[PDB]
Design a protein around this ligand. Structure first.
Ligand SMILES: *[C@@H]1O[C@H](CO)[C@@H](O[C@@H]2O[C@H](CO)[C@@H](O[C@@H]3O[C@H](CO[C@H]4O[C@H](CO)[C@@H](O)[C@H](O[C@H]5O[C@H](CO)[C@@H](O)[C@H](O)[C@@H]5O)[C@@H]4O)[C@@H](O)[C@H](O[C@H]4O[C@H](CO)[C@@H](O)[C@H](O)[C@@H]4O[C@H]4O[C@H](CO)[C@@H](O)[C@H](O)[C@@H]4O)[C@@H]3O)[C@H](O)[C@H]2NC(C)=O)[C@H](O)[C@H]1NC(C)=O
Ligand SMILES: *[C@@H]1O[C@H](CO)[C@@H](O[C@@H]2O[C@H](CO)[C@@H](O[C@@H]3O[C@H](CO)[C@@H](O)[C@H](O)[C@@H]3O)[C@H](O)[C@H]2NC(C)=O)[C@H](O)[C@H]1NC(C)=O
Ligand SMILES: *[C@@H]1O[C@H](CO)[C@@H](O[C@@H]2O[C@H](CO)[C@@H](O)[C@H](O)[C@H]2NC(C)=O)[C@H](O)[C@H]1NC(C)=O
Ligand SMILES: *[C@@H]1O[C@H](CO)[C@@H](O[C@@H]2O[C@H](CO)[C@@H](O)[C@H](O)[C@H]2NC(C)=O)[C@H](O)[C@H]1NC(C)=O
Ligand SMILES: *[C@@H]1O[C@H](CO)[C@@H](O[C@@H]2O[C@H](CO)[C@@H](O)[C@H](O)[C@H]2NC(C)=O)[C@H](O)[C@H]1NC(C)=O
Ligand SMILES: *[C@@H]1O[C@H](CO)[C@@H](O)[C@H](O)[C@H]1NC(C)=O
Ligand SMILES: *[C@@H]1O[C@H](CO)[C@@H](O)[C@H](O)[C@H]1NC(C)=O
Ligand SMILES: *[C@@H]1O[C@H](CO)[C@@H](O)[C@H](O)[C@H]1NC(C)=O
Ligand SMILES: *[C@@H]1O[C@H](CO)[C@@H](O)[C@H](O)[C@H]1NC(C)=O
Ligand SMILES: *[C@@H]1O[C@H](CO)[C@@H](O)[C@H](O)[C@H]1NC(C)=O
Ligand SMILES: *[C@@H]1O[C@H](CO)[C@@H](O)[C@H](O)[C@H]1NC(C)=O
Ligand SMILES: *[C@@H]1O[C@H](CO)[C@@H](O)[C@H](O)[C@H]1NC(C)=O
Ligand SMILES: *[C@@H]1O[C@H](CO)[C@@H](O)[C@H](O)[C@H]1NC(C)=O
Ligand SMILES: *[C@@H]1O[C@H](CO)[C@@H](O)[C@H](O)[C@H]1NC(C)=O
Ligand SMILES: *[C@@H]1O[C@H](CO)[C@@H](O)[C@H](O)[C@H]1NC(C)=O
Ligand SMILES: *[C@@H]1O[C@H](CO)[C@@H](O)[C@H](O)[C@H]1NC(C)=O
Ligand SMILES: *[C@@H]1O[C@H](CO)[C@@H](O)[C@H](O)[C@H]1NC(C)=O
Ligand SMILES: *[C@@H]1O[C@H](CO)[C@@H](O)[C@H](O)[C@H]1NC(C)=O
Lengths: 965, 50, 51, 51, 51, 50
């Protein structure tokens, strides 16, 4: 069966298809996207029942009566039961029964306008108040009951029943092939990938790393340094400090009583019977009840029973405080309460309701005040002249200190200050306070200030801490000049995968800091040469985005557009900034992407012999409709990187009003007036540019590649051993990096120099994709935000209101949405400026590395350069550099001096190098390297002497040095 | 509520009754009685002029 | 100028008598009055007038 | 009502408190977006100075 | 800047409400992080040494 | 300040200086990319270049 064993702790195993499990909603189920929510997806038990026989059972959210659980179990109070149905008679026969705290509720459906309608039999005292509730959705595949009585069918909440103890689901099954699974579940916090309005995959925001995924709405987190504050302690002591005052004290006690209707002769829900309300001591012959005393407390007394689905409460109504909440040290110059209306005062409605579905203002409380102080509302009684200070040192605490409040750690401190009683930052946060009675100074540290996490290959490899102990379960801590650092680091690494100012972090999470021909000598030299291919990515462009400001701001509503005209040139300046910058990107990239037909026809494996460049040359146009197509390494790279769920840039508008299917993200954002322009660097034009530029090395071709070796090594590296074996070594290096792009293969340390560059490149490319997605997501998501207006739905404002009043609501949305555009313009222009620098670097990398052979070191790979290949990538070019590296590293000896006709002696002023002799030749080379390259005139100066530390030569043997001496 | 073109569509989805973008605009809805899915296209989306 | 033709509307909406060469976004003006469509979950139609 | 976000939650029922706090969240996200423009501007000015 | 801590001052209800501002913090703090990474790279490239 | 040092900001033995006070607001100054040692090394090497 397609059902699974629950993982220990309650999780759903990551491979599971979610085949008929729905993301639950109260409204508005998303089509495609990544979303973070509390969902009943942490499973306390799961089992199944199959239609060979049937069993009928009552399942309690406390776990009583459940089936025989699979894989794992827990006995906590569940929040939900999920029933998942394999079979086609749906709910169209049988029943569901809820043991409610006051009685039995039966839900059932009927078609006795040939379609099915559903009814709830609330039964109390053995009278049945049968009620209609909705039409049945056509193919019920899941339904879900919360303990709080929400009923979801196929992921939408059709109605609510109020609190349930137990649920029974009763069915008669047409076949042995029928089954349903049942799961008991708890609300848990998850990140969900939704496609075609169905759950594709999820993660749970429980571990340190998964919280960092969830809080970035990303299943993949790029390598880097991420700020986080650890989750705070779930409940907190309270500490209170205040200046001593005369403790005159008062209670404002409010009593509410009411009764249900009953027996159906008066219908139970229809309006509260027996309503009585009082304040204590509200003798209205004196007028409104006023707080005369310095400290007061508010009490709400429920005289009524919670009979049936009846409830009652005070609500804030229109006050800048709530009844009850004024007990939290809220202050007034004067405050007064009444049950008859009072002038200038707000009113708090005393609301009874039935089933959260019918509501009655059984009374109201009228409240009036002066701001200022001398009146304070407080939790509990007080007495006399002496006033307590209550403090909880060294534990995170919720505080109200001299009428300032917050959460933090209060600690006694070494400072002494004469001034003041509270101390604060520029931001107005409390930093400390003085016990006025005693002269002690206390300091406030916020508990959980932000730490910072180092992420590398999607684990937290280490963290940076403001204190000397192992947060996040790391093994050890080290002090550093400005912070502590915590890790599972063995402090035995030297290669950094990340860098952050002066500090490099290596792959273990361990942290580190970062930065002869004169002599007859023994010096260490590679007697063999090996080659590595090293990979680098530069962003060349970003897909230009143009927004129709009118459509973004007004959502096409005609009254809004007339009002938007008053924002003189506000749209014009936003949209022209985007247009001008798009025009500059299009110009620059179109200038950069040259072509040369001669080189492009030469750019072929036929032109390279031993060198298997087959994976990097552009493919033939199998479609015929193009000059060129993507290379194998380009197709691997574009397919290996997941296009973001947060917003696409591969837009195509030519379906967005044919309308045969519900919009994908590309059309959905186009409806918001956001247009991605077609990419300035079409895969055809990239294949053309790239192919021409690879062909630029064919302009004998392997012998020209061997000539690029000759700049390192004249005599040896044209021998067939080097011609063949360096080509074979190149093919092996290419085979390793094409595997590394194709799929995860482990790098040992030797391959890790190359293979870390492939991993670095893919992480940089996925980061570019994700930043573009987030930038676009933040714009489209701001439309959902209502800027202190009635709603974000601008049509709904005009539906509700007379135009003079509606337009002032809409001005809030226009002002907000124009600010949201101005932010997105700064994101966009910033990214073009960053990309312009990256593009300039890339075209000089093309000149020096790709076209020329670079003479620099470390500018094109860590190694001695010979040639480069280029390929297309997301918004990008990616580079392959081929470089020559020490092997069989051992002594080759070097000479100060040469002795000429046995009689005259030669001494040398070339300290940058080493000078060495083999096979009737003399060769001069960077101090630790094997370059068979010959020395020159004016490297040497000559003396009427010789020394035994020299080598010995005739003036004709000097031809081995130069013909010139 | 809003303004747009309502059109019957080729999709089938089990979940929900209304479908929406990230921006909270309606993209479609389901006739709960009948199981048909309708899509909303805003009439006059932006064109672009040269 | 009068904001009546396609081009003059693009002048008016940019407050400019001269419009530089380029690509300009516009949404065509919408139909002047509209049918109404209503959809809701079935419910018991108990009805009242506040007159 | 106040900049002290804890004081808003001390005073108010959560449904009403959250709409007060949305003013502070919207304001403080704007204050960050301004500081980001200051920062990026200064890096671009400094990149020219460094070159 | 830790955008969550700046906006909410560590208050737990505020952080749950801040999640509704989809990617608003993410775009602010990643702009600062990316630009810091570029400054660190450029200056670290410039400051050579020769014993 | 930008001469920040976080390794005292929760030991809490004294009331915060500006560096910790702004760190409480979630603002972190990263350690300077150009340490006085690395500057002295670069500069010295570059003076030695004459
Ligand atoms: C459609 O709309 C409806 C409303 O019409 C939504 O219903 C609400 O959904 C939310 C979640 O989105 C519910 O909140 C969660 O409820 C869980 C159960 O709570 C009840 O029991 C507990 C005691 O067991 C009570 O405390 C609760 O409230 C009462 O107490 C508070 C005290 O402050 C009072 O203020 C209230 O007035 C009540 O008197 C409920 O009666 C609850 O477990 C859950 O708690 C987790 O999440 C919160 C933050 O949301 C954390 O602070 C808390 O620490 C819990 O998370 C940690 O703990 C678990 C424990 O196992 C660990 O696994 C982890 O460490 C974890 O991090 C939360 O409060 C809300 O109650 C509910 N309202 C109603 C009326 O039903 C639907 O969800 C919505 N549907 C969809 C799909 O969106
Ligand atoms: C979010 O969920 C969706 C749906 O599962 C994911 O999209 C799907 O991603 C897979 C790869 O993970 C794609 O499969 C590949 O498609 C190509 C082209 O057809 C094929 O050659 C490959 O062999 C492979 O089958 C799949 O096409 C794609 N489906 C859809 C409808 O987009 C998405 O990747 C998930 N995102 C995350 C971050 O998990
Ligand atoms: C789960 O809740 C149910 C309902 O309150 C509990 O079952 C009842 O428990 C009382 C006291 O033992 C008995 O008088 C009833 O006869 C029980 N009913 C049934 C059907 O067993 C149950 O004990 C609770 N279980 C847990 C684990 O708390
Ligand atoms: C839910 O309650 C209604 C109303 O009591 C039940 O419908 C009545 O059932 C009795 C007994 O069969 C009939 O005499 C009445 O004529 C029925 N009235 C209507 C309007 O049909 C209904 O049977 C209950 N639901 C169940 C048991 O599934
Ligand atoms: C660092 O090392 C510690 C052990 O010293 C690792 O701790 C384990 O973490 C996992 C995941 O939460 C738990 O299942 C284990 O039970 C933990 N073991 C112990 C002994 O605590 C920690 O995961 C390591 N972290 C990294 C990124 O290497
Ligand atoms: C269970 O469902 C069957 C459907 O055939 C029905 O006949 C029976 O009365 C139901 N019993 C209960 C207790 O709901
Ligand atoms: C309900 O639908 C069933 C399905 O076959 C049908 O047989 C029956 O006549 C219907 N009952 C009605 C419409 O009352
Ligand atoms: C109303 O309720 C209060 C509190 O129980 C009580 O003092 C009073 O006698 C009740 N009746 C009337 C008519 O006020
Ligand atoms: C401090 O507050 C706590 C909170 O319950 C209380 O238990 C304790 O008695 C208080 N201490 C004083 C001195 O009032
Ligand atoms: C602690 O306090 C005393 C007296 O104020 C002072 O001499 C000493 O220097 C202080 N030390 C620190 C670390 O604050
Ligand atoms: C920090 O922790 C380490 C390891 O427990 C300890 O050796 C050291 O003394 C502690 N204190 C400081 C200031 O480093
Ligand atoms: C430490 O690094 C050195 C040099 O790479 C190596 O010889 C040694 O095996 C390493 N030790 C461990 C176990 O990491
Ligand atoms: C490569 O060149 C050979 C002949 O040298 C030719 O036959 C072949 O078509 C070429 N391949 C491509 C795709 O250019
Ligand atoms: C070049 O390498 C690829 C790797 O997939 C292989 O398919 C191809 O046959 C090789 N061609 C030659 C000429 O070695
Ligand atoms: C656009 O609709 C056509 C209908 O013929 C379909 O073939 C094509 O795949 C669709 N393309 C996209 C990107 O929706
Ligand atoms: C450069 O390559 C050499 C030899 O493989 C290695 O020892 C050194 O650590 C590398 N340095 C960098 C910055 O990659
Ligand atoms: C139209 O719908 C059917 C069934 O859902 C499906 O097979 C077909 O591929 C769909 N075509 C398009 C263009 O949506
Ligand atoms: C940090 O506290 C230690 C306590 O030993 C003190 O010596 C040091 O001067 C303090 N540094 C700063 C910058 O506060």
């Amino acid at each position: 069966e397609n059902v699974f064993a629950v993982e220990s702790g309650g999780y759903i195993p990551s491979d599971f298809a979610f085949n008929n499990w729905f993301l639950l909603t109260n409204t508005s189920s998303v089509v495609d996207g990544v979303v973070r929510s509390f969902q009943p997806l942490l499973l306390n038990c799961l089992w199944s029942v199959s239609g060979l026989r049937f069993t009928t059972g009552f399942v309690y959210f406390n776990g009583t009566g459940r089936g025989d659980c699979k894989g794992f179990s827990s006995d906590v109070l569940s929040d939900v039961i999920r029933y998942n149905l394999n079979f086609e008679e749906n709910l169209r026969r049988g029943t569901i029964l809820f043991k409610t705290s006051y009685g039995v509720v039966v839900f059932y459906c009927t078609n006795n306008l040939g379609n099915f309608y559903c009814f709830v039999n609330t039964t109390i005292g053995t009278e049945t108040t049968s009620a209609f509730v909705g039409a049945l959705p056509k193919t019920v595949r899941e339904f879900v009951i919360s303990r709080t009585g929400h009923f979801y069918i196929n992921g939408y909440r059709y109605f609510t029943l109020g609190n349930v103890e137990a649920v029974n689901f009763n069915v008669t099954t047409a076949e042995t092939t029928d089954f349903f699974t049942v799961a008991l579940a708890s609300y848990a916090d998850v990140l969900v990938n939704v496609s075609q309005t169905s759950i594709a995959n999820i993660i749970y925001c429980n571990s340190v790393i998964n919280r960092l995924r969830c809080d970035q709405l990303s299943f993949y987190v790029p390598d880097g340094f991420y700020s986080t504050s650890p989750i705070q302690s779930v409940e907190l002591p309270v500490s209170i400090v205040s200046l001593p005052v005369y403790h005159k004290h008062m209670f404002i006690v409010l009593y509410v009583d009411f009764k249900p209707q009953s027996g159906g002769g008066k219908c139970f829900n229809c309006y509260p019977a027996g309503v009585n309300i009082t304040l204590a001591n509200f003798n209205e012959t004196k007028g409104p009840l006023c707080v005369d005393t310095s400290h007061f407390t508010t009490k709400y007394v429920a005289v009524y029973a919670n009979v049936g689905r009846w409830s009652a409460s005070i609500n804030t109504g229109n006050c800048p405080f709530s009844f009850g909440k004024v007990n939290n040290f809220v202050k007034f110059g004067s405050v007064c309460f009444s049950l008859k209306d009072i002038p200038g005062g707000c009113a708090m409605p005393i609301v009874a309701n039935w089933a959260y579905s019918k509501y009655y203002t059984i009374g109201t409380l009228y409240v009036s005040w002066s701001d200022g102080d001398g009146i304070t509302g407080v939790p509990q009684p007080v007495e006399g002249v002496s006033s307590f200070m209550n403090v909880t040192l060294d534990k995170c605490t919720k505080y109200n200190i001299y009428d300032v409040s917050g959460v933090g750690v209060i600690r006694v401190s070494n400072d002494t200050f004469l001034n003041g009683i509270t101390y604060t930052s520029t931001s107005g946060n409390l930093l400390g306070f003085k016990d006025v009675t005693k002269g002690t100074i206390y300091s406030i540290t916020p508990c959980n200030p932000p730490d910072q996490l180092v992420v590398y290959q999607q684990a937290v490899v280490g963290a940076m801490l403001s204190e000397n102990f192992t947060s996040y379960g790391f093994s050890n801590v080290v002090e550093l000049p400005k912070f502590f650092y915590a890790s599972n680091g063995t402090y035995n690494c030297t290669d950094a995968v990340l860098t952050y100012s002066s500090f490099g972090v290596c792959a273990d999470g361990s942290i580190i800091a970062v930065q002869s021909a004169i002599v007859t000598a023994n010096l260490s030299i590679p007697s063999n040469w090996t080659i590595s291919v090293q990979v680098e990515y530069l962003q060349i462009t970003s897909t230009p985005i143009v927004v129709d400001c009118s459509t973004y701001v007004c959502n096409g509503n005609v009254r809004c557009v007339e009002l938007l005209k008053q924002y003189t040139s506000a749209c014009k300046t936003i949209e022209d900034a985007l247009r001008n910058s798009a025009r500059l990107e299009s110009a620059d990239v179109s200038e950069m992407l040259t072509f040369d037909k001669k080189a492009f026809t030469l750019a072929n494996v036929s032109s390279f012999g031993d060198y298997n460049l087959s994976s990097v040359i552009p493919s033939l146009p199998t479609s015929g409709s193009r000059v060129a197509g993507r290379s194998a390494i380009e197709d691997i790279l574009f397919s290996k990187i997941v296009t973001s769920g947060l917003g696409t840039v591969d837009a195509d508008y030519k379906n967005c009003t044919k309308g045969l299917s519900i919009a994908d993200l590309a059309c959905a954002q186009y409806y918001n007036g956001i247009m991605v322009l077609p990419g300035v660097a079409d895969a055809e034009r990239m294949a053309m540019y790239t192919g021409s530029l690879i062909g630029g090395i064919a302009l004998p071709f392997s012998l020209a590649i061997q000539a690029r070796l000759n700049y390192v090594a004249l005599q040896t590296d044209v021998l067939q051993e080097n011609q063949k074996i360096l080509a074979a070594s190149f093919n092996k290096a290419m085979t390793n990096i094409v595997d590394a792009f194709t799929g995860v293969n482990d790098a040992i340390t030797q391959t890790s120099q190359a293979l870390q560059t492939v991993a670095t490149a893919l992480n940089k490319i996925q980061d570019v994709v994700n930043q573009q997605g987030n930038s676009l997501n933040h714009l489209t998501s701001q439309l959902r935000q209502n800027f202190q207006a009635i709603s974000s739905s601008i049509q709904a404002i005009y539906d509700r209101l007379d135009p003079p009043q509606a337009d002032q609501q809409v001005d809030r949305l226009i002002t907000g949405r124009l600010a949201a555009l101005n932010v997105f313009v700064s994101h966009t222009l910033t990214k073009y400026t960053e990309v312009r620098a990256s593009r300039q670097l890339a075209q000089q990398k093309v000149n020096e590395c790709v076209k020329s052979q670079s003479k620099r070191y470390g500018f094109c790979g860590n190694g001695t350069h010979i040639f480069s290949i280029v390929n297309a990538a997301p918004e990008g070019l990616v580079f392959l550099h081929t470089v020559l590296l020490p092997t069989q590293y051992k002594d080759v000896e070097a000479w100060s001096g040469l002795c000429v006709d046995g009689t005259n002696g030669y001494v040398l002023r070339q300290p940058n190098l080493a000078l060495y002799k083999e096979g009737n030749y003399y060769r001069i080379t960077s101090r630790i390297m094997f370059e068979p390259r010959i020395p020159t005139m004016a490297d040497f100066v000559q003396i009427e002497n010789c020394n035994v530390t020299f080598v010995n030569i005739s003036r004709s043997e000097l031809q081995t040095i130069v013909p010139e001496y």
